[PDB]
Paper text:
While DPP4 and FAP are extracellular or secreted proteases, [name] and [name] are located intracellularly to the cytoplasm and nucleus. There, they play important roles in diverse biological processes such as pyroptosis or ubiquitin-mediated proteolysis, turning them into promising targets for chemical probe and anti-inflammatory or anticancer drug discovery.
To elucidate the structural determinants underlying the formation of the reversible enzyme-inhibitor complex, we solved the X-ray structure of Sulphostin in complex with a catalytically dead [name] S730A mutant. Sulphostin adopts a substrate-like binding mode, occupying both the S2 and S1 sub-sites with the aminopiperidine-2-one moiety, and with the amino group of the (S)-3-aminopiperidine-2-one forming a hydrogen-bonded ion pair to the glutamates E248 and E249 of the EE-helix. Of note, E248 and E249 line the end of the substrate binding tunnel and typically bind the N-terminus of substrate proteins. Of note, the analysis of the structure also revealed an elaborate hydrogen bonding pattern between Sulphostin and [name], which matched the observed hydrogen bonds in the covalently conjugated wild-type [name] structure. After forming a non-covalent enzyme-inhibitor complex, the active site serine attacks the phosphotriamide moiety, most probably via a SN2(P) mechanism.
Author numbering:
A (entry chain B): 20 to 43, 52 to 865
B (entry chain A): 21 to 865
Amino acid sequence: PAARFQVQKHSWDGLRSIIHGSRKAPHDFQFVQKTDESGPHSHRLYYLGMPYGSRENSLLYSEIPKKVRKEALLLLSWKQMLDHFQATPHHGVYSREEELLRERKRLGVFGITSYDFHSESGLFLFQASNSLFHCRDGGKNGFMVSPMKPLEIKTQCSGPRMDPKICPADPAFFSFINNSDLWVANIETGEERRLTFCHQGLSNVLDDPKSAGVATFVIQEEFDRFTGYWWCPTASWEGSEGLKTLRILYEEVDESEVEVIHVPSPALEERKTDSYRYPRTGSKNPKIALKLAEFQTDSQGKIVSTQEKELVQPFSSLFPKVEYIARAGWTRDGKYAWAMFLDRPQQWLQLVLLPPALFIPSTENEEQRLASARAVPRNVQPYVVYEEVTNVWINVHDIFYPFPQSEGEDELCFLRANECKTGFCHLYKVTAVLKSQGYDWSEPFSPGEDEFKCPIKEEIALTSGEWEVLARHGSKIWVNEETKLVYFQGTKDTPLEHHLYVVSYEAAGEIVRLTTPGFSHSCSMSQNFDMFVSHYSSVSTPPCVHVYKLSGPDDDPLHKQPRFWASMMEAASCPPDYVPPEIFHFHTRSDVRLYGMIYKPHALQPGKKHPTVLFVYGGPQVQLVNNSFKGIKYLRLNTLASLGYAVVVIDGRGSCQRGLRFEGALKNQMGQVEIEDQVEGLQFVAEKYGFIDLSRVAIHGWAYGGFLSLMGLIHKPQVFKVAIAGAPVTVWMAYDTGYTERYMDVPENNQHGYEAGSVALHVEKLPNEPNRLLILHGFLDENVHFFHTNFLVSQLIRAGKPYQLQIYPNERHSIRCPESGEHYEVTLLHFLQEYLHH
Amino acid sequence: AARFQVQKHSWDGLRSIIHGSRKYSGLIVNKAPHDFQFVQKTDESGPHSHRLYYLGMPYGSRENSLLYSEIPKKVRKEALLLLSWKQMLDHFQATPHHGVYSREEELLRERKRLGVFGITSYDFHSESGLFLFQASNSLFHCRDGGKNGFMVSPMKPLEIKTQCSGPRMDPKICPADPAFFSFINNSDLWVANIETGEERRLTFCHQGLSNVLDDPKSAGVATFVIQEEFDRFTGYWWCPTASWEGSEGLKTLRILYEEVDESEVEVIHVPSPALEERKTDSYRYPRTGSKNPKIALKLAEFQTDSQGKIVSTQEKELVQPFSSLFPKVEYIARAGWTRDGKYAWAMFLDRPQQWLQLVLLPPALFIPSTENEEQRLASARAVPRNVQPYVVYEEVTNVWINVHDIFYPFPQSEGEDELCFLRANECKTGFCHLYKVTAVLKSQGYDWSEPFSPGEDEFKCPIKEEIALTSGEWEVLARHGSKIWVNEETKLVYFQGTKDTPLEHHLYVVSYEAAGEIVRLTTPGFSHSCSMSQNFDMFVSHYSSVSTPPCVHVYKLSGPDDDPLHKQPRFWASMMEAASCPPDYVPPEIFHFHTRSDVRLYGMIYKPHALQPGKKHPTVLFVYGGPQVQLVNNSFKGIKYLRLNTLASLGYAVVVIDGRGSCQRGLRFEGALKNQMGQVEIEDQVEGLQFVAEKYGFIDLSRVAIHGWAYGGFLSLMGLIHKPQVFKVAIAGAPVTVWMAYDTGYTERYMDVPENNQHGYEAGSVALHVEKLPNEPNRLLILHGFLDENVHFFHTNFLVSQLIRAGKPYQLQIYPNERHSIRCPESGEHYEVTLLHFLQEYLHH
Ligand SMILES: N[C@H]1CCCN([P@@](N)(=O)NS(=O)(=O)O)C1=O
Ligand SMILES: N[C@H]1CCCN([P@@](N)(=O)NS(=O)(=O)O)C1=O
């Protein structure tokens, strides 16, 4: 039979030398057309980027030429917008507000990480150096040819100005959040005005529990929403004085009843915590309402008045089953505000139109409030234009595109991504009928079943089949109303690649792929539908960023050619010591297709079985196995393979980009099906490849992966010789409402699932042998609290079980510091060297 | 010579060894009765001379209760009387539900090192026979002796009803009138009438604001550093006498209290023991070099009528601010009253803790607190010219002041301008000794309405006489419960000391009239903890040796009344017989040697069990090595240090050395570590280890582990840093890793402020020397209680941060539910199993 390969033993400092030795793209695109026929450029393309000489992200541009040589590859020059400007604060130490927002968004890079852009005026608005800055380019002032100094926006406000946005109707104005309230300011005059008065500014913060315009913890962490306010895109002219009204839809929250937890602050020497309103599963979420903030401006841009407006009947009366606002915004004409509402079980979503006339001025005067309520026209109401229901869960999809209405039309046509209908996320063209029932809004009423529900006149599937339109985590559609085409991203070719597609929403038929097969693409489309960018890679090829021109006859828009135009970034040379993993698939005993990757031992010899690391995440919303470059994020897996470890990765049931039924397998039973699929995958790899030593398998993962590493050691102790569990969830009753309830229900409704899935309650089944269990955790983790590890250790002590522990005192949910990253990898190599070998 | 190899066990094998060692220890923890009060019986016919009251956990109970035993007038000389433990309280549970105390009571128990459940203290008023104590999240009382007579069976204790919100802490009976008691509620001083139920708030420092950090004043409360570093758990003191000033038949009662303002004190967060709530408690933690609380002594007065109704109250403050009168005072160590109530007194320390003043404060120096400037000026002008503070004693040193509790003022004659007192003083000779001091109290007059700036030696009293009652190169014990008993009829002072040997505490008596012969009252070959009857006819000794578990014996002082100094201690009865020395337990052997500098150091050795000649054994150097502790003495170590016997039973040699810095050897000996903590301690540990190896011949110097907790964890790391060829492995429990993160009271005493001793702080902070820790794995195990509010988990967290930056390996264990010490048996067992496993795998080659 096969010989058993022995990894070379190194000293601790030898392992440090291996790790240190081993560690020896433009984004956020805005296309602007140039309208000078004499000049050689069709567009200026703006973006964020860190070029190789820079140590932070800054605002950059490249010039797109009208003509390119067919025989040559143009590499576009990256031009600086800002002149020798440091956007990063001193020592990369952000305010707590900016630091936590960077954690919620998974932003690791320093400098400008987002900007707001107003195309007509050419205004850029962004956070930098613990303040707000702006610059102008294009519009009236024209296009810069060397970097300019950005202008700081002065304030009399105390503490950070968060979530800055330009007023779409009038770019003289921008909005921001300060001390949990919504403000506006005139960028030209410097005038600032507070719009909302939720935050009293009391000495005891726990007595001051309301905010306006703020996405709370669970909304940011579990619903991917980082804003609590939405500019109305249009101005209005109500009243006799001729003042211009500007409007902001905002979420008001009351966190009074939300549980408070303390997490250590990153300034360790101060030995203090930050307080979080952390809704643990089964406990109270914030009380929420949508409100309308208005202010009026004169011809000189002076802010003459402000008004808080609220729903004529309470949010809780109109929409009694709503737990969460997933998303909100406006129709392009500003005729309707809209909101995406979820029930607490997250099995029922409503898309609701809210006309501004349904909101009345807030007042303590009961007679004035009654007068305002009585004056609301009878034909004004909410319209539930769409409803999604499932026995699995609603994934929040960002795709909702309302078409403009004609005058006197009692219908709304819109594009909607819908997963629950077929179990795969697809594009539908929906026509809802908006008919007024007639309501006396001064008279309180409890709405009945389907009270505001709109009849659906038409619902056309634009896409169908066992593949997904991508509608989450930055994915969007682009709609050309001139050509009646919708551009979208999807897995139609393969679940291993993201591609750009186009289909008609008028005459739904042929879907045209616009991206190159054999790569996974992240695309940005011009609002003029003339050009697009793709950031793309493969398992073998590092990322490149290419600009494409949509070319061909204007009478055949569906079959426009994606013509390669220029490169923004050529693929880096694949290092000689880097060997890409190999993708495979197999069918389980239940005949489900699973995909996996194998990092083959480097310089592999036949007839030899190698010690193996099963690298696991295995949780919802993640797919580890796809045809994209893994060497930037997962270099440590190549390093393991270079020492002669085989590394196996399996996307089991519960993982994403395979439809709702596939991820639905773990419903109310997290931990159970995932480990079965991991073991089937490992055993398939051993049978297919023949270089896996099944007597020497380590299971290793972080967060959900740490949870499954422990589940593996508990339930399959003959399969897994050692577990290395990073930031593990050890008790589901300690995780939050938004995530845990979606997949597991509330604890009272799923006692068996919570008990079976909580590894800290099964410590009696963990090994009675030392050196089979290494626990790792960031001390400052505000997501999977250090509590999870602390509670697991308390249980290990009670059960008389041995454990090894490493803490990252300066790290939250991920290891960001390179020295801590290296120490983690050295520790992993040492643990495997000493304890995976017999 | 052959190398002994310890038998390798499985993890579950080690669990069975540790579980067996503790379950079948042959000893009981928290067994001894304590807090003794002797009361004479007044029945000449009856068979008992005294009732003896105490706290004790009787066999067939899981908590401390209030107990008594009857002391017979006659005992048989040839028989051993075992006193029957009688319950005072009828089937009463004093422990709260699931042994979960309020945060206030829990932290007080941590400061006091109280592990036992139930009644942990009582206040007793002997004349009235009133007992006052905390139990079951409330206040209870009972009565026995005096007028009510002596109970023959247990009685139900009476709860004291309140309309206060939150705990009533630090309850005390009014000495002048036992109808009244005091307590602290929400950081303010209250009094109550126990007979009528009437309650009255005296101080109004605590506003009760929603934001606690905007509410930084307390009255009657000892703050964190005072409790943790000065062994003071109260911030108020009853005046022992009533007065009758004013214009009605009203009686005035008085309480001296410390008012503190913690506004400028740094706030830190420590995790709460309810881990599932994921919250912290806020502490006003003065780190070394940062602000201590602003402090003042004030006087609370109230008047009572003939019905015991509280008619009126007054807050009074010093006529000139505390900060003006006493500008160099950082800390109030101690306070109280003269027995006649004529003076309040305070023990003041400067911030360097090198200057102590004993200061008398007459009540007339305190005036009513007021916002009305005209009323305040009138009050200040009315203070008599001859009223002033008196500095009756001053202690100065170039080492540090240890706070000694022994101050006994003799009551003054009317019109006497002198005060006589007994005082324990260490700084005079470098050894703690008893002095009879006479100070002259004369005033040359002050205008208290005029703004005040004290000169050098303002208020300083001439010393007429200072008699040394004790002398030599040994100590009177004056700290951590040690006290004197003064019989004014016989002119004798009873005290404890190290006169016979630094290895044993003994009870002594000497005359304070004609200072001469010191008589020892306790048996040599044991260390004694004694309680004396207030009638000086009987005493209790709680005593043990290295070889004999503790017993508690009652002794009668007998002989001719005309020769009180030579009264003979006669064994009378047993409160608790010594358990048999367990067959599996082998006592350690005490030795001494002289260093190369000719300092005598004491040590102990646990020999490997069933030792064979010509065999070198792996060795554990068990270390504390910090100030205020002596590990090596002739007392039983098997209750607290059973794990050292367990190590010896597997064939480890265990060595303990009391190096320079350790206590019970005088100020010069402990003063060696001044401004250089870490440096001399390791030199003495290594000399001790090397002496033991040369003398005993069974030490394998190639296989030595260093292990300690707290200061011992600090020294374990210092050993591995500075002597990496001596120490193969270090196991550091709850280590201090950065002195700049420890508190004012302790750190500044031994090290000065960071700004004045940058080199000492740098050299003594092991977290700043991680580059010198081993680059090899399995040489360093760190252990820490997650909830430690003393040596914060931060010390370990910061050490780990530095280890990561330096690219060093480490092993780590946390005790999620433990503070500064491991109290839970499951955690204690897990710690010992982990230690055995670490030594088994990594001390062997
Ligand atoms: N709240 C969840 C959302 C799904 C992904 N994750 P993580 N653990 O994968 N984030 S990450 O920053 O580790 O990628 C979560 O924590
Ligand atoms: N603040 C000091 C006072 C002196 C003794 N100690 P420890 N470390 O000996 N505590 S103990 O509870 O272990 O006895 C201190 O922490």
